[PDB]
Write an enzyme that holds these catalytic residues in place. Sequence first.
Site, mmCIF file in Angstrom:
data_model
loop_
_atom_site.group_PDB
_atom_site.id
_atom_site.type_symbol
_atom_site.label_atom_id
_atom_site.label_comp_id
_atom_site.label_asym_id
_atom_site.label_seq_id
_atom_site.Cartn_x
_atom_site.Cartn_y
_atom_site.Cartn_z
ATOM 1 N N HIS B 88 0.848 -1.183 0.000
ATOM 2 C CA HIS B 88 0.000 0.000 0.000
ATOM 3 C C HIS B 88 0.886 1.236 0.000
ATOM 4 O O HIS B 88 2.080 1.165 0.289
ATOM 5 C CB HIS B 88 -0.929 0.034 1.219
ATOM 6 C CG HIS B 88 -1.855 -1.140 1.305
ATOM 7 N ND1 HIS B 88 -2.971 -1.261 0.509
ATOM 8 C CD2 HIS B 88 -1.828 -2.248 2.086
ATOM 9 C CE1 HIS B 88 -3.599 -2.386 0.794
ATOM 10 N NE2 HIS B 88 -2.929 -3.003 1.752
ATOM 11 N N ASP B 91 -1.399 8.737 -1.647
ATOM 12 C CA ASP B 91 -1.290 9.845 -2.591
ATOM 13 C C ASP B 91 -2.227 10.933 -2.078
ATOM 14 O O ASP B 91 -3.442 10.727 -2.014
ATOM 15 C CB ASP B 91 -1.660 9.348 -3.998
ATOM 16 C CG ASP B 91 -1.886 10.464 -5.041
ATOM 17 O OD1 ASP B 91 -1.844 11.694 -4.763
ATOM 18 O OD2 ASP B 91 -2.136 10.060 -6.204
ATOM 19 N N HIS B 93 -3.847 14.437 -2.815
ATOM 20 C CA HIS B 93 -4.066 15.473 -3.819
ATOM 21 C C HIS B 93 -3.692 16.854 -3.295
ATOM 22 O O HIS B 93 -3.537 17.782 -4.093
ATOM 23 C CB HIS B 93 -5.535 15.479 -4.272
ATOM 24 C CG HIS B 93 -5.900 14.322 -5.147
ATOM 25 N ND1 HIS B 93 -7.114 14.242 -5.797
ATOM 26 C CD2 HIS B 93 -5.216 13.203 -5.482
ATOM 27 C CE1 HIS B 93 -7.166 13.118 -6.488
ATOM 28 N NE2 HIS B 93 -6.020 12.480 -6.332
ATOM 29 N N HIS B 128 -5.745 8.984 -1.418
ATOM 30 C CA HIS B 128 -6.104 7.605 -1.718
ATOM 31 C C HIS B 128 -4.830 6.794 -1.882
ATOM 32 O O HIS B 128 -3.741 7.339 -2.084
ATOM 33 C CB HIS B 128 -7.002 7.492 -2.967
ATOM 34 C CG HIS B 128 -6.375 8.016 -4.234
ATOM 35 N ND1 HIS B 128 -5.519 7.264 -5.007
ATOM 36 C CD2 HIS B 128 -6.482 9.216 -4.856
ATOM 37 C CE1 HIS B 128 -5.120 7.978 -6.050
ATOM 38 N NE2 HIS B 128 -5.688 9.166 -5.983
ATOM 39 N N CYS B 129 -4.985 5.481 -1.758
ATOM 40 C CA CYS B 129 -3.916 4.550 -2.077
ATOM 41 C C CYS B 129 -3.701 4.506 -3.584
ATOM 42 O O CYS B 129 -4.628 4.710 -4.371
ATOM 43 C CB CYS B 129 -4.269 3.161 -1.538
ATOM 44 S SG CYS B 129 -2.970 1.958 -1.676
ATOM 45 N N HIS B 138 -7.352 -0.812 -5.410
ATOM 46 C CA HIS B 138 -7.266 -0.377 -4.017
ATOM 47 C C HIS B 138 -8.246 0.747 -3.730
ATOM 48 O O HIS B 138 -8.832 0.799 -2.643
ATOM 49 C CB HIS B 138 -5.848 0.071 -3.658
ATOM 50 C CG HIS B 138 -4.881 -1.066 -3.505
ATOM 51 N ND1 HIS B 138 -4.072 -1.217 -2.402
ATOM 52 C CD2 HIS B 138 -4.604 -2.110 -4.322
ATOM 53 C CE1 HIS B 138 -3.328 -2.299 -2.548
ATOM 54 N NE2 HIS B 138 -3.636 -2.863 -3.703
ATOM 55 N N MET B 143 -10.027 2.431 -0.174
ATOM 56 C CA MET B 143 -8.790 2.993 0.365
ATOM 57 C C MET B 143 -8.628 4.445 -0.089
ATOM 58 O O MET B 143 -7.751 4.806 -0.875
ATOM 59 C CB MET B 143 -7.603 2.137 -0.036
ATOM 60 C CG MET B 143 -6.539 2.168 0.999
ATOM 61 S SD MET B 143 -5.414 0.765 0.969
ATOM 62 C CE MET B 143 -4.270 1.418 2.191
ATOM 63 N N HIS B 248 -27.368 16.183 -3.107
ATOM 64 C CA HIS B 248 -28.596 16.955 -3.006
ATOM 65 C C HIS B 248 -29.136 16.730 -1.607
ATOM 66 O O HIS B 248 -29.165 15.587 -1.144
ATOM 67 C CB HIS B 248 -29.624 16.498 -4.044
ATOM 68 C CG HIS B 248 -30.976 17.102 -3.851
ATOM 69 N ND1 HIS B 248 -31.272 18.392 -4.233
ATOM 70 C CD2 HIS B 248 -32.108 16.604 -3.298
ATOM 71 C CE1 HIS B 248 -32.527 18.664 -3.922
ATOM 72 N NE2 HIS B 248 -33.060 17.594 -3.362
ATOM 73 N N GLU B 272 -29.346 23.609 -5.786
ATOM 74 C CA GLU B 272 -30.212 22.484 -5.438
ATOM 75 C C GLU B 272 -29.406 21.193 -5.445
ATOM 76 O O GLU B 272 -29.527 20.359 -4.533
ATOM 77 C CB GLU B 272 -31.417 22.417 -6.397
ATOM 78 C CG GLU B 272 -31.071 22.065 -7.843
ATOM 79 C CD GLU B 272 -32.249 22.187 -8.821
ATOM 80 O OE1 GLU B 272 -33.314 21.572 -8.600
ATOM 81 O OE2 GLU B 272 -32.082 22.891 -9.832
ATOM 82 N N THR B 273 -28.502 21.084 -6.408
ATOM 83 C CA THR B 273 -27.678 19.913 -6.660
ATOM 84 C C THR B 273 -26.386 20.443 -7.262
ATOM 85 O O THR B 273 -26.389 21.475 -7.935
ATOM 86 C CB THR B 273 -28.394 18.942 -7.616
ATOM 87 O OG1 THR B 273 -29.649 18.546 -7.051
ATOM 88 C CG2 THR B 273 -27.580 17.703 -7.895
ATOM 89 N N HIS B 299 -28.050 12.536 -6.528
ATOM 90 C CA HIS B 299 -29.308 12.721 -7.238
ATOM 91 C C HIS B 299 -29.330 12.073 -8.617
ATOM 92 O O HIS B 299 -30.160 12.451 -9.450
ATOM 93 C CB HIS B 299 -29.685 14.207 -7.341
ATOM 94 C CG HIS B 299 -31.167 14.432 -7.362
ATOM 95 N ND1 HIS B 299 -31.970 14.012 -8.401
ATOM 96 C CD2 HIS B 299 -31.998 14.990 -6.449
ATOM 97 C CE1 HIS B 299 -33.228 14.323 -8.137
ATOM 98 N NE2 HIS B 299 -33.270 14.922 -6.962
HETATM 99 CU CU LIG Z 1 -3.709 0.102 -0.872
HETATM 100 CU CU LIG Z 2 -5.679 10.768 -7.376
HETATM 101 CU CU LIG Z 3 -34.951 15.571 -5.926
#
Ligand SMILES: [Cu+2]
Ligand SMILES: [Cu+2]
Ligand SMILES: [Cu+2]
Lengths: 333, 333, 333
Positions: B88, B91, B93, B128-129, B138, B143, B248, B272-273, B299
């Site tokens: 494992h 990473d 961001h 994330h892995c 993964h 993960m 939503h 709304e969304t 949604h």
């Molecule tokens: Cu992993």
């Molecule tokens: Cu990434």
């Molecule tokens: Cu709705």
Amino acid sequence: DISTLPRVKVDLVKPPFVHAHDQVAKTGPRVVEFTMTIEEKKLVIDREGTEIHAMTFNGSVPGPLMVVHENDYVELRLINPDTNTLLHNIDFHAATGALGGGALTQVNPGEETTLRFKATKPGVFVYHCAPEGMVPWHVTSGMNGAIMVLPRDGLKDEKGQPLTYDKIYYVGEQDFYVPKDEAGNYKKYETPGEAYEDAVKAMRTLTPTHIVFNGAVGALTGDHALTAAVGERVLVVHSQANRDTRPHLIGGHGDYVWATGKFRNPPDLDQETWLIPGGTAGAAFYTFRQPGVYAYVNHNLIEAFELGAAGHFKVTGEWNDDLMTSVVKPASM
Amino acid sequence: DISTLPRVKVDLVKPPFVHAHDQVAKTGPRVVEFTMTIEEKKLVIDREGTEIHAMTFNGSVPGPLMVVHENDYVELRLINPDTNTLLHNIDFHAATGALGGGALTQVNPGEETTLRFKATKPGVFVYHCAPEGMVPWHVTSGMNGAIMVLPRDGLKDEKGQPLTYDKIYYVGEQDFYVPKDEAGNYKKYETPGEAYEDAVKAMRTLTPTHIVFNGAVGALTGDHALTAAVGERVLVVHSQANRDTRPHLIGGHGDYVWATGKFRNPPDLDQETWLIPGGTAGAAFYTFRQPGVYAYVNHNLIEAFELGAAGHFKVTGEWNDDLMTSVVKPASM
Amino acid sequence: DISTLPRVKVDLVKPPFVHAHDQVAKTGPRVVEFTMTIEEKKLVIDREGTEIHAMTFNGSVPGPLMVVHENDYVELRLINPDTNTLLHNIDFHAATGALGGGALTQVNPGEETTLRFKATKPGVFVYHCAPEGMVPWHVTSGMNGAIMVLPRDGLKDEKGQPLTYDKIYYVGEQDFYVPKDEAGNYKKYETPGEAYEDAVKAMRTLTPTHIVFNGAVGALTGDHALTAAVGERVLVVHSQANRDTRPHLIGGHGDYVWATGKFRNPPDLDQETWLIPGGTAGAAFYTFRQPGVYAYVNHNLIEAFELGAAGHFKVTGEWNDDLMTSVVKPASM
Ligand SMILES: [Cu+2]
Ligand SMILES: [Cu+2]
Ligand SMILES: [Cu+2]
Ligand SMILES: [Cu+2]
Ligand SMILES: [Cu+2]
Ligand SMILES: [Cu+2]
């Protein structure tokens, strides 16, 4: 005191048309009264005669566009006639509380209810049916529409100056999941209840069989094309209650676009294509500068031209050779 | 000189809860020390007992939310106990260089490593892995998590004025691709390695079998609903490491939304969304104005109500009949 | 009078490279002359030798990037040699009228045409083939590219100050729908016409078999990695003519991003990942601060690492331990 506000009844019109309204409010806040009648009906959705049990507000897919102004009150009388077979309700994304109204509007066949809510936020919003345990089935059977809450002083551009449209059209985009037999033919059913188990399996593939504007393949083509003239300013409201879409006007642009549909935000300028997330309504403003036929599509071009999500504008006027011209017409080398 | 900065150790809490922190930084830049322990474990993801081999940071899906301030240093001690079976890494961001840290944090079972990076950009970010050759496996095994880098003077609205939340919750949305037999039943496996070949085929269909909040269908319903009171200001951080989502709040709105999660940009208002792209974390701010139950959903309503991407808020307080009221309760015509 | 404007012929270069141009216009509006030759050709798209009948502008997938300035005139000579077998045309999203030009540029094998249009809106835009009845088939066979219309005074940041890039690269992302036999093997065909019926069935599943940068799995890796140095400012133009994508620079960010590609709008800042809707081109600006290898991916990580949508940057320079460092290298506990 609501008892002392003015009231106006508004009769709705079938999409893509929109009931008459003022862009700039001429009065103070009002109670705007609407009535919608639920209709379960058979609908033929393509040229091959594929038939589905649609569930509609007022007999159309999408339901009609309602137009009010910010801080008006919306009073909806919702009727479920005893010729229908299912429980229905309504959820306004424009409203605050009680699951958009869905908790307060459950009506069995033969029942009616009247809901009121304050339209506190300007924008275009989705409304849809949402009965517990069966929400996606009712929504993807066509039971959705939109409501536009205009700012009381109308639309503005990114610099705060007034934008005024000459025409407004409402395009409701619908993803359908028609069950299929083992060879790929679409199944027919006698009643909505008969389709439920197959419809759930079809929905779970997440792959629509049809994606249409205004309820059917080709519904906005031919004699039913949208119309405009060079120089006219057109507002196009577009909703998708369940699935992302990416509208595009072929040969044109979105001069001003509220892709997520909310008018307190400034518009995006000069869009070629914009993303309307599933569960959202958006609005795009364009001024036509060339005559002729335009296509209005979901720019996943498979969804547009294979599954049905394409319509037409017919635009009249004079051709402008400054903007575009054929220097050498197609000819042999 | 990092040697002369203050240091603080922070113990993480299980989602949807978030470890204690200050919104406005009370000190200068610090080295914030975190420890996470990788745990491969069996997880039951639906009411039918479907079981998967999850790969987790700290035993939860999603991993815990880390909170720091802009220009703090993050120092992560990452432990891969010898009871695990796979390589494992991690990473971020939020970080700059070395594939987000993934090139410097590869740990076999029985190994540990300590990484440090400067949090130069404010926002919510995915971590994330990402082990070479096996990244999607993964990540879609759970993960992933998120880290929030607050501006040192806290959140602001579109006009630069302070926004302060009373509660914060972290919703990690996970798409799962559980292999199926020919009849559509989900397969079980004894070890993660046994599932790999089937998992790849399942991932390649691009169709999730389950999409869940907080690791399981219904994980944020019932007794595990999120809670708030009328008048409280709530920040909801939402991440999706692999697939687009469109959150939503049913019956509410996103008053202020950073859909792509980055705080130097002004928020979108009155959503709304909103669309959170796969690989992104977003944040939405809402002030509750009505009591009752709210649903928080993706949604795409098939993904929400058929595949699992729905949770609940329980909100206490007084009902406001100005915003919404049932004029005529459902009754026979 | 177009007759009295200056004219310049520009020869196009193969992606990911971009023909020479000025960021800030040194002259007034000009007629910029381009020539493209349509080539239908067999293309091998993965390491397994999967072969498709590609339909290309100028022999590459994507077609070349054209660069002009706002209010220039674009004059395109489009040649369909008689060795091709299909009707083709071109639709510029940058243009106004006649379906983007598609109505005026239909050329059978052995025909040519010259189209002119005014580039009235600054931004990056898609162009693609769009023959009536066969639009998705030509586009998903690789017949798309992009055109960049720069503001005459160049790019600006969110505060109106000049942004200047040192290098520019064009990444065209292509979804392919290769028909499969009953066991899952990809089919081969002798001519494009032979594939049509199978290709339509494959497109209708909405599930790509391959999603690639620059025409092939691994096309932008190895010796074909994009290159930069620490301190260099890089503009990456990314287009997707048919399907949404969500680019992400692993180990970096989008410092300034126009996700929907239109330069009159202010950029989004500090993006980890951004959504480019199908039918759109976007642009992201980054200044490299760390050396080493970076991955550039669609952050649906299945699409990236299983279906092909990943490329590499190789960046030279000095490592900055302030931004990131391994405090304790991976070691046994
Ligand atoms: Cu992993
Ligand atoms: Cu990434
Ligand atoms: Cu709705
Ligand atoms: Cu209903
Ligand atoms: Cu073509
Ligand atoms: Cu197009």
